[PDB]
């Protein structure tokens, strides 16, 4: 039964940990966002094929450029994440995540994931960005980033609402089969 190592990378502002928790519990954690998501595996069926999906978080390693790649070898698929309401996290896909992921894993597939989709229509978020001469990242911007980095898919999701979330990991699995 095919085993899949999926590593989740990106800035602290993507909410990597919450993404994973929301995915694996089927719920935004709400009351308290845990800081720890331990390496995880579960069976999922995809296009009729059962698959053992492995998920590794990397939160905490954002400042340790030599430690991060300790997790990269033998990964089957990466999620390179950014928050749709942090332009700096989006830019770091280009500046930081893609280069190291590719350097260490040249032939491994990348899914480009925009998180925090629910905060992109939110007045308070939007106004906070307007005050810094910025806007949320929109759909064509992620598409153009995906293309620039060789990402097999660009996908947007919210862990709050679950919108697009299960699709993220479906598609990480389809990128390997």
């Amino acid at each position: 039964m095919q085993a899949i190592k999926c590593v989740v990378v990106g800035d602290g502002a993507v909410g990597k940990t919450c993404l994973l928790i929301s995915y694996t519990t089927n719920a935004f954690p709400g009351e308290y966002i845990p800081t720890v998501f331990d390496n995880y595996s579960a069976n999922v069926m995809v296009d009729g094929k059962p698959v053992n999906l492995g998920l590794w978080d990397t939160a905490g390693q954002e400042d340790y450029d030599r430690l991060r790649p300790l997790s990269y070898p033998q990964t089957d698929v990466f999620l390179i994440c950014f928050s749709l309401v942090s332009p700096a996290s989006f830019e770091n896909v280009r500046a930081k995540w893609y280069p190291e992921v590719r350097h260490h894993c040249p032939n491994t597939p990348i899914i480009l994931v925009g998180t925090k989709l629910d905060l992109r229509d939110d007045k308070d978020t939007i106004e906070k960005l307007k005050e810094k001469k910025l806007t949320p990242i929109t759909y064509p911007q992620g598409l153009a980033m995906a293309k620039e980095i060789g990402a097999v898919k660009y996908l947007e999701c919210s862990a709050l609402t679950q919108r697009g979330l299960k699709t993220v990991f479906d598609e990480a699995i389809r990128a390997v089969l």
Binding site: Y32, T35, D38, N39, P73
Partner: protein, 179 residues
């Protein structure tokens, strides 16, 4: 409320880390050192490279750090001092991190499916590689928990800043030690 959730997570995750290391030592390690199974000549007597100092890391957590973290359960705002008291012990993560690339290449190039067979036999969800990343994960995680406590503990929170200092310095020092 929030400082309590964080403290609870600290402790729960510490127990799981101790359990995880223990399982790694008693399954993947023990099968090499036992003399129960046939070792690939690629890795024979190379358990020091594979596992690095994970034994000594486990004994720190299992003999000292967990019991002391537990003593701070009702004192979340003081828990930074635990990291200061035991700062020297954390220097062993520096050694662990340095060895981790050599560990991983050895397992790839020379272990074949020794560890995979051992995983199936014991029915473990975690592969040897998943266990051996855990120390790297754990050591970069304490600083996230301390930062969380700082967002919700009062002026009596220099007993967190000093802890965090130490827990920012250890992973940076291990980071800076890498070839």
């Amino acid at each position: 409320r929030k400082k309590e959730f964080i403290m609870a997570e600290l402790l729960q995750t510490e127990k799981a880390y101790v359990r995880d290391l223990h399982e790694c030592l008693e399954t993947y390690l023990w099968e090499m050192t036992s003399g129960v199974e046939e070792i690939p000549p690629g890795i024979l007597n190379k358990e020091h490279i594979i596992f690095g100092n994970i034994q000594e890391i486990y004994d720190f957590h299992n003999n000292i750090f967990l019991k002391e973290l537990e003593k701070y359960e009702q004192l979340p705002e003081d828990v930074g001092h635990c990291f200061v008291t035991w700062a020297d012990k954390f220097q062993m993560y520096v050694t662990y991190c340095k060895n981790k690339p050599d560990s991983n290449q050895l397992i790839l190039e020379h272990a074949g499916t020794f560890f995979d067979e051992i995983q199936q036999r014991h029915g473990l969800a975690n592969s040897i590689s998943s266990y051996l990343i855990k120390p790297v994960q754990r050591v970069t995680k304490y600083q996230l928990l301390l930062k969380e406590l700082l967002t919700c503990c009062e002026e009596g929170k220099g007993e967190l800043k000093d802890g965090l200092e130490v827990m920012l310095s250890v992973p940076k020092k291990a980071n800076d030690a890498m070839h």
